[PDB]
Amino acid sequence: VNPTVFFDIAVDGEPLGRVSFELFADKVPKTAENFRALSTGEKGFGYKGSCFHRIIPGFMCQGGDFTRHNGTGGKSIYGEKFEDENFILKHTGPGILSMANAGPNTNGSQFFICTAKTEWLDGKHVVFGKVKEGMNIVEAMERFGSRNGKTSKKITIADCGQLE
Ligand SMILES: CC[C@H]1C[C@H](C)[C@@]2(NC1=O)O[C@@H](C[C@H](O)[C@@H](C)CC/C=C/C=C(\C)[C@@H]1C/C=C/C=C/[C@H](O)[C@H](C)[C@@H](O)[C@@H](CCC(C)=O)C(=O)N[C@@H](C(C)C)C(=O)N[C@@H](Cc3cccc(O)c3)C(=O)N3CCC[C@H](N3)C(=O)O1)[C@H](C)[C@H](O)[C@@H]2C
C-alpha cells in the first residue's frame, strides 16, 4: 500500500496543525521512498526541524533544505542528487506534492506543495504524492507568504513521520 507520512507544522514555535500525504510508491517508487525516509529520519537526517523557505500565495509552498537552511541545500538518501524518475503524473491542482530541482536530474530533498494547477511545471518536476488531510493547514501557511516568497513568520516542520 502507498505509504502515508505526516508533517506537524509550527509557526514561530506555535502548533498550526497536521498535514498528511499519500506517496505514490506505485508510480514513482524511488522518489516516494526518498521522501518517506527523510520524513522518518531513519537515515540520520531529514525534514524534522527544517522550514518552508519560499511560500508564494496562489502558487506553492517550498521546503526541504535541512543542510544549509537558506534554500540552496538538501540531499537525498541515495547521495547528493538523483535522477528524474519519470514524468507520468501531472500537476493537476491543489495538494500535489512535487520535487524542486536545479535542472534535469538534480533531485535532492527540496519539494513543493501546489495550491493551484500548475501546468507549466509538467515534464520539469517529478510529481510523487498528494495531500491526504490538512489542506486547510497548507492554505493557512499561504497567509505568511509574499510575491517573492519570503515568509513573514518562521514556518517549520516541528515533527514528521510515517503513519501508514
Ligand atoms: C504575474 C505573476 C505570475 C506568477 C505568479 C506566482 C502566478 N501567476 C502569474 O501569472 O503563478 C502561477 C503559476 C505559474 O503559471 C507557474 C506554473 C509558471 C511560472 C513560474 C513561476 C515561478 C516562480 C514565481 C518562482 C520564482 C522563483 C525563483 C527562484 C530562483 C532561485 O534564486 C534559484 C532557483 C536558486 O534557489 C537556485 C540556487 C542553486 C544553488 C545550489 O545555490 C536553485 O536552483 N534552487 C533550487 C533548489 C531546489 C536547490 C530551486 O529552488 N529550484 C527552483 C527552480 C525553478 C524556478 C522557477 C520555475 C521552476 O520550474 C523551477 C524550483 O524547483 N522551484 C519549485 C517550483 C517553483 C519554483 N521553485 C519557484 O519558486 O518559482 C499561479 C497558478 C498563480 O496564477 C500565481 C499568481
Could you tell me which residues are beta bridge partners of residue 162? Answer: 5
Grid coordinates of 154: 518562521
Architecture field, domain 1-164: Beta Barrel (2.40)
Pocket test for ligand 1, best of 38, 50, 59 (most atoms within 8 A of CB): 59
74 within 8 A of 67, measured Cβ to Cβ:
yes
**Domains in the chain: boundaries:** 1-164
138 within 8 A of 61, measured Cβ to Cβ:
yes
Q: How many whole angstroms from 102 Cα to the centroid of ligand 1?
A: 10
Indicate the SS3 state at residue 61: strand
DSSP designation for 66? -
| C-beta 118 within 6 A of ligand 1 | yes
Is 6 part of the annotated catalytic residue set? no
* AA identity, residue 24: F
- Round to whole Å and give the CA distance between 115 and 57: 8
Q: Within its chain, how far is the Cα of 143 from the centroid? A: 18
Deposited experimental method: X-ray
Grid coordinates of 12: 514561530
